[PDB]
Amino acid sequence: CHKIPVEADFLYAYSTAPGYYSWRNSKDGSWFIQSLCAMLKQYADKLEFMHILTRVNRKVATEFESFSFDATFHAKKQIPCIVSMLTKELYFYHH
Amino acid sequence: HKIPVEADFLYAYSTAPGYYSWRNSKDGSWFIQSLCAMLKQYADKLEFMHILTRVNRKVATEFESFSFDATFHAKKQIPCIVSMLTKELYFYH
Amino acid sequence: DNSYKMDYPEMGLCIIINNKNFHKSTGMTSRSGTDVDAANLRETFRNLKYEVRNKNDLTREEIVELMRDVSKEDHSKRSSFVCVLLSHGEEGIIFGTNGPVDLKKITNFFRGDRCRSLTGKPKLFIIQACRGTELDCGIET
Amino acid sequence: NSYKMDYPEMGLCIIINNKNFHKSTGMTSRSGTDVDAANLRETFRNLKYEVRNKNDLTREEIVELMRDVSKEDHSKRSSFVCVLLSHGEEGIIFGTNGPVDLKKITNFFRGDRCRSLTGKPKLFIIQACRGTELDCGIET
Amino acid sequence: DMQX
Amino acid sequence: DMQX
Domain C1-141 adopts which CATH fold? Rossmann fold (3.40.50)
Please choose, from the candidates B34, B18, A33, the residue with its C-alpha nearest in 3D space to the C-alpha of residue C34. Answer: A33
Strands C10-18 vs C78-86: parallel, antiparallel or unpaired: parallel
Q: How far is CA D27 from CA B26, B43, C66, D24, D128, in A?
A: 19, 35, 43, 8, 13
Distance CA A69, CA D111 (A): 26
Contact yes or no for C125/C89 (Cβ under 8 A): no
Distance CA C47, CA C31 (A): 26
| Helix, strand, or coil (residue B29) | strand
Distance CA A58, CA A66 (A): 16
Q: What are phi and psi of A75, to 5 degrees?
A: 65, 35
| Helix, strand, or coil (residue B52) | helix
Contact yes or no for D56/D90 (Cβ under 8 A): no
How far B73 CA lies from chain F's nearest CA (Å)? 9
Chains A and B touch (3+ CB pairs under 8 A): yes
Contact yes or no for D70/D110 (Cβ under 8 A): no
Residue A95 makes CB contacts below 8 A (sequence gap 6+) with none
Q: Which amino acid is at B83?
A: S
What is the SS3 assignment for chain D? Answer: CECCCCCCEEEEEEEEECCCCCHHHCCCCCCCHHHHHHHHHHHHHHCCCEEEEEECCCHHHHHHHHHHHHCCCCCCEEEEEEEEECCEECCEEEECCEEEEHHHHHHCCCCCCCHHHCCCCEEEEEECCCCCECECCEEC
Domain D1-140 adopts which CATH fold? Rossmann fold (3.40.50)
Q: For chain F, say whether D127 makes contact (Cβ under 8 Å).
A: yes
| Centroid of chain to Cα B14 | 5
Experimental method for this entry? X-ray
| Helix, strand, or coil (residue B93) | coil
Q: Tell me the domain boundaries of chain B.
A: 1-93
How far B68 CA lies from chain D's nearest CA (Å)? 16
What is the SS3 assignment for chain A? Answer: CCEECCCCCEEEEECCCCCECCEEECCCEEHHHHHHHHHHHHHCCCCCHHHHHHHHHHHHHHHCCCCCCCHHHCCCECCCEEEECCCCECCCCCC
Q: For chain F, say whether B29 makes contact (Cβ under 8 Å).
A: yes
Residue ranges of B 26-85 with Cβ closer than 8 A to chain A: 47, 49-50, 52-53, 56-57, 60-61, 64, 74, 76-85
Burial class, D132, CB count within 10 angstroms (exposed 0-12 / middle 13-18 / buried 19+): exposed
CB contact under 8 A, A12 and C125: yes
Question: Which of 2.60.40.1180, 3.30.70.1470, 3.40.710.10, 3.40.50.1000 is the CATH number of A1-95?
Answer: 3.30.70.1470
Burial class, B20, CB count within 10 angstroms (exposed 0-12 / middle 13-18 / buried 19+): buried
Residue A78 makes CB contacts below 8 A (sequence gap 6+) with A15, A16, A17, A20, A21, A22, A23, A31, A32, A60, A61, A64, B4, C136
Strands C51-56 vs C10-18: parallel, antiparallel or unpaired: parallel
| Helix, strand, or coil (residue B59) | helix
Of residues C23, C88, C115, C137, which has the active-site annotation? C88
Q: Which amino acid is at C54?
A: N
Q: Tell me the domain boundaries of chain D.
A: 1-140
Q: Domain B1-93 is in which class?
A: alpha beta
Residue B23 makes CB contacts below 8 A (sequence gap 6+) with B29, B30, D30, D31, D32, D33, D36, D127, F1, F2, F3, F4
Distance CA A37, CA C82 (A): 14
Residue A87 makes CB contacts below 8 A (sequence gap 6+) with A4, A8, A9, B53, B56, B57, B60, B61, B78
Distance CA D114, CA D79 (A): 12
Distance CA A47, CA C124 (A): 17
Q: How far is CA C36 from CA A12, A28, A72, B28, C32, in A?
A: 22, 7, 26, 50, 9
Strands (DSSP E) found in chain B: 2-3, 9-13, 22-24, 28-29, 80-83
Contact yes or no for D110/D75 (Cβ under 8 A): no
